[PDB]
Amino acid sequence: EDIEFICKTIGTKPVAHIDQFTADMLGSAELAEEVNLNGSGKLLKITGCASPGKTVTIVVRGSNKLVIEEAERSIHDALCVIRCLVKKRALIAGGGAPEIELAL
Amino acid sequence: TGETIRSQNVMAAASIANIVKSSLGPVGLDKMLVDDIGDVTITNDGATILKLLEVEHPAAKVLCELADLQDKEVGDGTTSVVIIAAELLKNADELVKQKIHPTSVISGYRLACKEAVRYINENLIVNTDELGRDCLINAAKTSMSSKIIGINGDFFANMVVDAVLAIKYTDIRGQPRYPVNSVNILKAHGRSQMESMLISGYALNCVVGSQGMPKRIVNAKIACLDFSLQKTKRESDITKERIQKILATGANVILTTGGIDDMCLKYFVEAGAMAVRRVLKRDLKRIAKASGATILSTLANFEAAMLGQAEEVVQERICDDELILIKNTKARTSASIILRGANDFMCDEMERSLHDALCVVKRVLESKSVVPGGGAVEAALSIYLENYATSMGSREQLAIAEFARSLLVIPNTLAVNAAQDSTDLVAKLRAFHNEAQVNPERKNLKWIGLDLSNGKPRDNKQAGVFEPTIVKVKSLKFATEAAITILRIDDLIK
Amino acid sequence: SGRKVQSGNINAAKTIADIIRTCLGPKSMMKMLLDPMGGIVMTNDGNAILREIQVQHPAAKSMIEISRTQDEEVGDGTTSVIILAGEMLSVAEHFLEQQMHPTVVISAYRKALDDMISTLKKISIPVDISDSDMMLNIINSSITTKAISRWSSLACNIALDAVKMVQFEENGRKEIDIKKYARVEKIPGGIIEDSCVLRGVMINKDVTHPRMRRYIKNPRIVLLDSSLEYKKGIQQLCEDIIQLKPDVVITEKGISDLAQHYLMRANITAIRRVRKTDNNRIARACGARIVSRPEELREDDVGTGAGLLEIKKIGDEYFTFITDCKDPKACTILLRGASKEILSEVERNLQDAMQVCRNVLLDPQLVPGGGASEMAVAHALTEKSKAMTGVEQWPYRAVAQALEVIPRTLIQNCGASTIRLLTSLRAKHTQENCETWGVNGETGTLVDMKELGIWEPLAVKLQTYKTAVETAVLLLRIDDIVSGH
Numbered sequence A: 001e002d003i004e005f006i007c008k009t010i011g012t013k014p015v016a017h018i019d020q021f022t023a024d025m026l027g028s029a030e031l032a033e034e035v036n037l038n039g040s041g042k043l044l045k046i047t048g049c050a051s052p053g054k055t056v057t058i059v060v061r062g063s064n065k066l067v068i069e070e071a072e073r074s075i076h077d078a079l080c081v082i083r084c085l086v087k088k089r090a091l092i093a094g095g096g097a098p099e100i101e102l103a104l
Numbered sequence B: 001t002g003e004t005i006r007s008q009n010v011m012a013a014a015s016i017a018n019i020v021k022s023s024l025g026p027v028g029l030d031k032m033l034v035d036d037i038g039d040v041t042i043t044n045d046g047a048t049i050l051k052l053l054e055v056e057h058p059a060a061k062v063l064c065e066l067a068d069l070q071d072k073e074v075g076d077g078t079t080s081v082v083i084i085a086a087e088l089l090k091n092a093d094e095l096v097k098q099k100i101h102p103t104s105v106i107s108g109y110r111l112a113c114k115e116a117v118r119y120i121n122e123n124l125i126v127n128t129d130e131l132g133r134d135c136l137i138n139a140a141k142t143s144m145s146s147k148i149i150g151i152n153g154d155f156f157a158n159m160v161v162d163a164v165l166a167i168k169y170t171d172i173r174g175q176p177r178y179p180v181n182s183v184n185i186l187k188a189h190g191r192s193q194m195e196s197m198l199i200s201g202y203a204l205n206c207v208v209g210s211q212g213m214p215k216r217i218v219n220a221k222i223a224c225l226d227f228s229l230q231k232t233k234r235e236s237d238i239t240k241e242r243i244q245k246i247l248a249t250g251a252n253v254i255l256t257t258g259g260i261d262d263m264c265l266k267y268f269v270e271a272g273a274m275a276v277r278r279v280l281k282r283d284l285k286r287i288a289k290a291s292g293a294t295i296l297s298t299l300a301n302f303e304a305a306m307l308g309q310a311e312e313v314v315q316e317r318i319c320d321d322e323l324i325l326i327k328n329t330k331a332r333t334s335a336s337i338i339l340r341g342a343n344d345f346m347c348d349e350m351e352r353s354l355h356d357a358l359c360v361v362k363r364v365l366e367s368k369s370v371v372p373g374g375g376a377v378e379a380a381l382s383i384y385l386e387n388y389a390t391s392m393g394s395r396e397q398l399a400i401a402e403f404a405r406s407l408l409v410i411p412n413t414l415a416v417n418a419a420q421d422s423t424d425l426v427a428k429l430r431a432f433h434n435e436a437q438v439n440p441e442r443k444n445l446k447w448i449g450l451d452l453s454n455g456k457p458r459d460n461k462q463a464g465v466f467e468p469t470i471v472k473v474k475s476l477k478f479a480t481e482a483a484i485t486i487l488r489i490d491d492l493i494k
Numbered sequence C: 001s002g003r004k005v006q007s008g009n010i011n012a013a014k015t016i017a018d019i020i021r022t023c024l025g026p027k028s029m030m031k032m033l034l035d036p037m038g039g040i041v042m043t044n045d046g047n048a049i050l051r052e053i054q055v056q057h058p059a060a061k062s063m064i065e066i067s068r069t070q071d072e073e074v075g076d077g078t079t080s081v082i083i084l085a086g087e088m089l090s091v092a093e094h095f096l097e098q099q100m101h102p103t104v105v106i107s108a109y110r111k112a113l114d115d116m117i118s119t120l121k122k123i124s125i126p127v128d129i130s131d132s133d134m135m136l137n138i139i140n141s142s143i144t145t146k147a148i149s150r151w152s153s154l155a156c157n158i159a160l161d162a163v164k165m166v167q168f169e170e171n172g173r174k175e176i177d178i179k180k181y182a183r184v185e186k187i188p189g190g191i192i193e194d195s196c197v198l199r200g201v202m203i204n205k206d207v208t209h210p211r212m213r214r215y216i217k218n219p220r221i222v223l224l225d226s227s228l229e230y231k232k233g234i235q236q237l238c239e240d241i242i243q244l245k246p247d248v249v250i251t252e253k254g255i256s257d258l259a260q261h262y263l264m265r266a267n268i269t270a271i272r273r274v275r276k277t278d279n280n281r282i283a284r285a286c287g288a289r290i291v292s293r294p295e296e297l298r299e300d301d302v303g304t305g306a307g308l309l310e311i312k313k314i315g316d317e318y319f320t321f322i323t324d325c326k327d328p329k330a331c332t333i334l335l336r337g338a339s340k341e342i343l344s345e346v347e348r349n350l351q352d353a354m355q356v357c358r359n360v361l362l363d364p365q366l367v368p369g370g371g372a373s374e375m376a377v378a379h380a381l382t383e384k385s386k387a388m389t390g391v392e393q394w395p396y397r398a399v400a401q402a403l404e405v406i407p408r409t410l411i412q413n414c415g416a417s418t419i420r421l422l423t424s425l426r427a428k429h430t431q432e433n434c435e436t437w438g439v440n441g442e443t444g445t446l447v448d449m450k451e452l453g454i455w456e457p458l459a460v461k462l463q464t465y466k467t468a469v470e471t472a473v474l475l476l477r478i479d480d481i482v483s484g485h
């Protein structure tokens, strides 16, 4: 399922047979190294690419799986807020002020 | 059943601490780690405990992986951070059952941690200077105590400190980075252990290669070679051609790792080279880097100045042996310490004691900012934070106060692990550090450690038990972060 | 929780020790092993009892491990080690309940062990080595009460001839010795008296066609793990051998007749299908070196090995009698007989006496057994404890009190009362200055130990005491076991 995303990111065309397999048929990257974090998990760091088109990655860490999910949800919430700023151009003050104002 | 996941998580924290609570300290009791297959292990340090401890509750998993993170960051302190975190969790759970909303607790804990690290970076000890030797020799003696060498242990503690000062090798960043393997072990027979002494260079016990090689050589070029010098049936027989060719390049003192030769006598007389076999591989690599040279296998055809240096090689009677006193190399790395007596079997524990004294002294030498160990830091922090909680004045007074009270569990566990009355000893420590702040003239009362030999309050800067500042700072930070993360988790009901 | 796990550990130790408490001495009470298949087992050896039985408690498993190690390290006394450990833990139980930390208890135990190590050497009687008279007395004393009663002559002569054939002068004077490099040749056939001793290594493997000069006046053995082929089209090994000109070459695979003739041209005797468990002693007896890199080949590759080789055929077996080799460090002891049903135990007792001789070289000391040494060390500890102060003195006395379990069991498993005999032994031992009386094991009657004539090597008793004390401190230093089950 991640094949399409990887091909979109690092610009690798899919290869099904050895007949038409070449280097430019794939997508190159500046650096590809594996590191160890705390000795309990190995994450590959393919840092830098020739054409990293519309893609970033953050190694979301945390105390547990679930608080890591919380950090992911926070990041996606920020992304979606930015998207809402893009689509709709109308800003209001927050922090409970709009709710109490509209209630009054 | 449970009534609050806060209670369940703090019970998990209390259990995971109580498992590892006892093992803290050099006098900690070992733990019996059984597994499914029955291959049981015994250990006394918390890192080895938590690396293979079978955990089941998610809060326990979080705590143990924070512990692993701290261990991978700074090393020592896993037990301390786990214990402090569990104490903070249980105190904060009691305080939240005291009807305090947890976010105020988190804010108070963060403020207390900030104030604590600022205090530590302000009331530490900078004794790790060239003027500090009495404290260092005292620390070496105390770590070396309880042995039959205590009569002459003073000289050993005096020689180790200035040896590691001398053998200290600076790095590319202009900071002291002592290589532990630079100091090499050395056996001796005849005279007992009280006649041992410091040698500024490695001395290998081997056969006399030749007698024409003088004690001091102005120009030495180590053309170290693995192959022996023998005649068989750039040279087919490795006896003359490469040796003379590199002599033309300037190889004067050649440390031939290979075997002896029948006609090597004249060549060693005219050049001044040695042939020594059965050289320990770590010692060979150290003398290679001490002399600033690499290991050459063959010499088939660089040779200009890369060859190593052995300026002074004393050829005399040392411990009724003709040890090759290869010293004064280009890089001050090659040295060794004699171990007299009869042989190494009974003094192997003496060898390990010398190794651990070297290790603790060299760790003290690094991390120039240092703090007194043995619970003095914890008592001083408690005294500071007790006043700071009232001075700050917002609704986090209780949070900061219980953070201060929770910090005094490390002296408690050290005291109980040393068979002494925990509460009495920690109360004595607390009262001693009260004068550090209330009395402005008692400034030099801030390092009352815990002399575990007798379990009595004692000056510790003189004693010399030391902890790197970074270790304590990161330990406190990680404990506070773990406490905040666990307290921020309550989204279950059980 | 807390000390409860310590109490459980020491309870397991006590309940595993007392199982075979009664099975030591010349009148050991015999035990039952009932497998859940209807079978019934006759056994006296407590070591065999514990090996056959299986237990689940991990502390008991560790004690099984230490017992096995002591069995495979110095020899006998394993039952005594287990009994001592169990008694010391049982007596430490009372102090653990006394609400004192295990640290002070183990410190007291360490000091007591240090005192015992010295007081053992204080009371040990000197012995001489190679002195046939009282060495044979020791053979009749301790090497007996095995199945060699009617055959003690063969065991004694074998031991006395083979004491000086595995000695290693590495760092001292023959104090390094092993019982494995000796060539024991246990083959049935003929009478038991056919066993002999030879100065060399024997091989049960031999060439299929020994119609050749297998023996040379000075064989130069070189180990080689490669197998010779017909030719390069490897023959190159033949010329490589020819370069240094040896006369004997060892390989682990067969050699063809054409290859055999090629090696005859190479002036070397090819030996095939050798075994590593025999190749190691071949190299030890001959000082061989193995090397195949052409650049590293030098004059040191081939060295002098045997001195007088020969091959005979006894009992239609392709023997290989290398004798009078260079190093008398891995020599031969022959083992023949009509049947092998006891000779294995015979050679086990031979290795026991070999350890006896090796430690006699280490320390020419004998301790008065039969409870004499135990009572002597207990008395020394009790009298030394009078000056001791502090709470740690009570364990320093309880270790001595619990060490008298050996004579207690000896008296118990002979019918005699275990109370009156012990009280009489203790009371008279104190007033006695340098007597060291030891209770007879058979009659269960008090007797001066010199008259009875029983002794043990100092090293074995020292190792037993050290292992018992270290087991006690290890089992008392455990604070918790929870890591799963």
Ligand SMILES: Nc1ncnc2c1ncn2[C@@H]1O[C@H](COP(=O)(O)OP(=O)(O)O)[C@@H](O)[C@H]1O
Residues within 6 Å of the ligand: B023, B024, B025, B026, B045, B046, B047, B075, B076, B077, B078, B079, B080, B373, B374, B375, B450, B451, B452, B465
């Ligand atoms: N000689 C000593 N006297 C008193 N306390 C000591 C001594 N040496 C070390 N300590 C204490 O040991 C504690 C750290 O040990 P620990 O955290 O158990 O090591 P690890 O993290 O490797 O398990 C420190 O707080 C220090 O006070």
Ligand SMILES: Nc1ncnc2c1ncn2[C@@H]1O[C@H](COP(=O)(O)OP(=O)(O)O)[C@@H](O)[C@H]1O
Residues within 6 Å of the ligand: C024, C025, C026, C046, C075, C076, C077, C078, C079, C080, C145, C369, C370, C371, C406, C410, C439, C440, C441, C442, C454
């Ligand atoms: N004739 C004897 N009289 C008294 N005690 C004896 C006699 N023979 C052996 N013993 C006792 O037996 C003990 C040795 O038995 P042990 O080494 O435990 O046998 P194993 O190790 O084979 O179980 C010695 O301590 C010794 O006191």
